[PDB]
Amino acid sequence: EPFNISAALIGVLSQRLVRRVCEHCKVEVKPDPETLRRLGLSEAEIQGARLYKGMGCERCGGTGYKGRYAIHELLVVDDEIRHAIVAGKSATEIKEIARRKGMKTLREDGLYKALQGITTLEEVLARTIE
Amino acid sequence: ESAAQKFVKQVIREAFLQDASDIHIEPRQNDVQVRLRIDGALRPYSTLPKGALNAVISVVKIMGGLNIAEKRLPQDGRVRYREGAIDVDLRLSTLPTVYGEKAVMRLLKKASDIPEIEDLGFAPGVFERFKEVISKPYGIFLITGPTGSGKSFTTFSILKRIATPDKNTQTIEDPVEYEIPGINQTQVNPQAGLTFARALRAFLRQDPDIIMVGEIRDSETAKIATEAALTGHLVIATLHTNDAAQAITRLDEMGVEPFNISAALIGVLSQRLVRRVCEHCKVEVKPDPETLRRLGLSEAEIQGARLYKGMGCERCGGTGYKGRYAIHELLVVDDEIRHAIVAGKSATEIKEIARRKGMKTLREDGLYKALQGITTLEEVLARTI
Amino acid sequence: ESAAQKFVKQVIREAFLQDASDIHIEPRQNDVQVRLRIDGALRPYSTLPKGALNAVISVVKIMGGLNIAEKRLPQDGRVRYREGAIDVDLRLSTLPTVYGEKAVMRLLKKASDIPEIEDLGFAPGVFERFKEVISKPYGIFLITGPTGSGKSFTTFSILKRIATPDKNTQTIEDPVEYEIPGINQTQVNPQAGLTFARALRAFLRQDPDIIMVGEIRDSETAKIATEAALTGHLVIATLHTNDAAQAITRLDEMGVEPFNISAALIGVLSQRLVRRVCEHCKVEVKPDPETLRRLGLSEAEIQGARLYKGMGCERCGGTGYKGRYAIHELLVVDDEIRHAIVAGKSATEIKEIARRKGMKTLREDGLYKALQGITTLEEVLARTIE
Ligand SMILES: Nc1ncnc2c1ncn2[C@@H]1O[C@H](COP(=O)(O)OP(=O)(O)OP(=O)(O)O)[C@@H](O)[C@H]1O
Ligand SMILES: Nc1ncnc2c1ncn2[C@@H]1O[C@H](COP(=O)(O)OP(=O)(O)OP(=O)(O)O)[C@@H](O)[C@H]1O
Ligand SMILES: [Cl-]
Ligand SMILES: [Cl-]
Ligand SMILES: [Cl-]
Ligand SMILES: [Cl-]
Ligand SMILES: [Mg+2]
Ligand SMILES: [Mg+2]
Ligand SMILES: [Zn+2]
Ligand SMILES: [Zn+2]
Ligand SMILES: [Zn+2]
């Protein structure tokens, strides 16, 4: 029952595993500002932003990767979401409500960690096609 | 029924010897017309008396394993024909018309008919760029054009060269055409729910290196195909667009975000087939410089320009043509194009960048082959509207 | 020999000689009314006494091999009527009404009646755009209009020019109405399961070049037909929409993805039939210059314009009109209409784009043809809108 869902659900965690850039052949790439822009990054943020990949070396196969790392989407339920569940708004509407109140999406989270060299942007984009 | 049998045998044998692709057995008001498709156009073969219709349809239904009793509904099946040196599979389709059932027999090509890339007909410079693209370790490479323009030949030509025993090569096809050895093939089976998208999702758990998507018809398939490339697989996939740049806009329209296209797409090959001028009745013709101008020929080039046509002789069935030839437009994605995609530029804007970067258009490629007498100018303009 | 036989024979004769499409034999409270439909409108033909009804209804039923005893249920059939020099196929319907059974006989046109595209009635500028559209090697071309506005005539006129013997032309029709030689024709068969969509899907295994879809009326037929255009065949299909641009939005509403419509649609023909001024009672009239301005014409078109209308003579049964003439609205898809389709723009906005790029509206084509004394202002406003 939606009213039982509204009363009980405290949060939803969605996650993905991305491949982790090898530490020993890691290298910078100049990102396209437009890519970052269309990924919802602020123009202040763009100024510094650098991205990374693994050129491939003995320590990582040829792959440029070693290990995996998680990316997260954390929907914390408040009165507004509870209200939206009761009403019956769609998964897409709840998602925009939760995003407005400050929830980061998988791809936003993935991009952030890509901007620190944990993963490539390609890994992120791979994991986040809805 | 033996005279029927006798006729099916001879028409199949003749189509095979003449390189016909399709046999049409068409009941009309008073007779049964029989036509062969050769080089894409239909010719008259013969005429049967209307009384012969059922005997022939019967022979052909049995050959395909179809139901003689069913004449109100369409039917299709496959024919494994063996008769001397002639060894050919046929897709067989029967269809109710106002004057009885019409049968169509498509001759299926084999792996042995698939050329190496060096015999695909690429012009010198474009061929080197093509070798480049198909050799990249991951990304999505799109082959686009209307039906019967050689897409599958090019597709399996590429796999013949890059699908090596150290890779897992996997296809999804509708239906599987050639049994290529060294390559895993899976058929779309809608009666069971195995659609293009369903297979494509399964492929991602099959540890692929190379994936071939026979057809990207829906938005789901476009997205999983792009996820495959972004994951680090090489993807050969087929789309229906009129030129190369329009493949980029079609992925956007189907719901692939430009930043995904930009990260995944390595290149687009648009192609067509043009009929080949009969060597036996070839005649030089003098071009219309108004035409050559309007097609962008520098007056330096227009001065030495010769064009050609087949007069039409017995060797080409009075058509002026024998065989077909391919024309290409290869768009290779580089950094400038990657930027154009994320900046949201149109198909027309993307093409102008590609051209300035050296891509010859379909018309330009065909013009250059017509200037050698491989095809007529008319045939080039008819496939590039 | 009997009076009923003689009346039926006579009224079909009159229908044939006057190009009537339908004969209506209607029981009324104290007599029987017979009307002919000529140039789309009913006109009186004759009156019979109530006592003549069952004899005349029997003659019709026997012709179509219907059941004379069954009078409480509707029946329908066909007869090939042959009398004197006349050889016409007729559709026969009988229906219970409160004063007896009503009969309707429709006179069916033949392949011989299909005109070449040059005589379809196209205005000079639109006819060049028309043949360029039908000349494309693949894509879907939609022909739209209410019943009896000439969709089938236009459709098969096109196929008479383009269905050449180097191509395989295949139709699906409900039913097949003409014997066109050179093309392959298939009739939907409800009893068998041979629906529109079921036959369309089979055509994809029949090596076609031109596919004719008689009716797009369900979502599956709309999706397959657009699919066949996209893969690389020429598709000529009929739709019921009030408008050229509405055919685009209709496909969308019917579930065809807008990106496939943008990719496959080459154009949309909307058409109507208007009545032609009878020559033998044709007379000039003077129009209000104002009434032409309020209809949209500029002052240069008003300056030369002379109007006409028929007074009413025996040749035209007093209507002022004999025969009909088509008026057209031709939407040719270009890049800008493609972007509007992908962008989800409305029918209204798409219409504006088509017009700015040179599409003549139905009314505008109508008025043009009125200023040539082909039809009246009357008829143009009757059969069109803003
Ligand atoms: N490079 C080429 N040169 C000459 N002929 C070719 C070439 N490629 C294909 N053909 C001929 O064209 C026919 C059709 O080619 P193919 O099946 O590749 O077209 P397609 O675009 O895959 O068609 P469909 O749209 O039905 O899948 C082939 O059987 C062969 O006869
Ligand atoms: N271009 C034309 N000019 C004049 N009259 C025409 C024209 N086209 C058709 N007609 C007349 O209109 C009649 C009906 O035409 P047609 O069957 O093409 O209409 P339709 O719109 O397909 O009707 P239906 O609703 O039965 O499918 C024809 O029998 C012919 O008499
Ligand atoms: Cl995952
Ligand atoms: Cl039929
Ligand atoms: Cl082609
Ligand atoms: Cl009308
Ligand atoms: Mg193919
Ligand atoms: Mg009709
Ligand atoms: Zn490394
Ligand atoms: Zn020759
Ligand atoms: Zn008159």
Numbering used by the authors:
A (entry chain C): 271 to 400
B (entry chain B): 15 to 399
C (entry chain E): 15 to 400
What do the authors report?
Crystallization trials on the complete TtPilF hexamer were unsuccessful; however, limited proteolysis gave rise to a fragment of approximate molecular mass 44 kDa which was purified and yielded crystals which diffracted to 2.44 Å. Mass spectrometry was used to confirm that this fragment corresponded to the C-terminal half of the protein, encompassing the N2, CTD and Zn-binding domains (designated TtPilFc). TtPilFc forms a flattened hexamer, with 2-fold rotational non-crystallographic symmetry relating the two trimers. Inspection of all 6 binding sites revealed electron density consistent with bound nucleotide; however, there was no evidence for ATP hydrolysis in any site. ATPase assays were carried out on the TtPilFc fragment which showed that it was not enzymatically active, confirming that the fragment is catalytically inert in solution, as well as in the crystalline state. Thr651, Gly652, Ser653, Lys655 and Ser656 form part of the Walker A motif involved in binding the γ and β phosphates. One possible explanation for the failure of the TtPilFc fragment to hydrolyse ATP is the conformation of the linker polypeptide between the CTD and N2 domains. Significant differences were apparent between the TtPilFAMPPNP model and the TtPilFc crystal structure. Superposition of the CTD and N2 domains gave an r.m.s. displacement of 3.47 Å for Cα atoms; when viewed from the top, TtPilFc is wider by about 6 Å along the long axis and shorter by 7 Å along the shorter axis, leading to a flatter hexagonal shape. We find that TtPilFc is wider and flatter than its equivalent density in the complete hexamer in the AMPPNP-bound state, indicating that the presence of the N1 domains does affect the relative orientations of the ATPase domains.
